[PDB]
Design a protein around this ligand. Structure first.
Ligand code: MWH
Length: 140
């Protein structure tokens, strides 16, 4: 169903983000999310450089960091751009975890991302046409 899609969408996104850094951890939705995320990460490159320096990820701090950042991200509601930002931020947390020899946290972050999508973003996504609408709007 939709939830099986979301977990797959998270796993394929993280897998690509980590592969970009040399770490080995329909498809139109995945391709669209990759391309939109790559655009987002270039546009907001400076923002992520600043935020990554403020995260201080450890196994003890990671869950709280994820929770507070994502709550700030969606403070004014949901739209597709913020959903892209959510994936990009999760990708950044995963890359930082690997950078810090904390690679097991990738699995935790993937689970947190999946549970946030299924519990908090699923209603908006379906209310706004599902992932198919995202592909229509921003796909190649
Ligand atoms: O309204 C917004 N966005 S939109 O819906 O109009 C729209 C616009 C364009 C696109 N697609 C562009 C295509 C794609 C195909 O290829 C060709 C171009 C899409 N999309 O694809 O969905 C949607 C909008 C809301 C929020 C923030 C935003 C959030 C968070 C942050 N920060 C930066 C640091 C981390 C994060 C953060 C900050 C505070 C708290 C937590 C966090 Cl994590 C910065 C900006 C930016 C927004 O603008 C953009 C601008 N360009 C973007 N490009 C891709 C996504 C996108 C979003």
């Amino acid at each position: 169903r939709t939830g099986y899609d979301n977990r797959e969408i998270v796993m394929k996104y993280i897998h690509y983000k980590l592969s970009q850094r040399g770490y080995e951890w329909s498809e139109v939705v995945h391709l669209t999310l990759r391309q939109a995320g790559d655009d987002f990460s270039r546009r907001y490159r400076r923002d992520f450089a600043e935020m990554s320096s403020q995260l201080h990820l450890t196994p003890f701090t990671a869950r709280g960091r994820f929770a507070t950042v994502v709550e700030e991200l969606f403070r004014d509601g949901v739209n597709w751009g913020r959903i892209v930002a959510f994936f990009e931020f999760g990708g950044v947390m995963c890359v930082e975890s690997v950078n810090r020899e904390m690679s097991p946290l990738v699995d935790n972050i993937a689970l947190w991302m999946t549970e946030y999508l299924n519990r908090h973003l699923h209603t908006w996504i379906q209310d706004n046409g599902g992932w198919d609408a995202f592909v229509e709007l921003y796909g190649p």
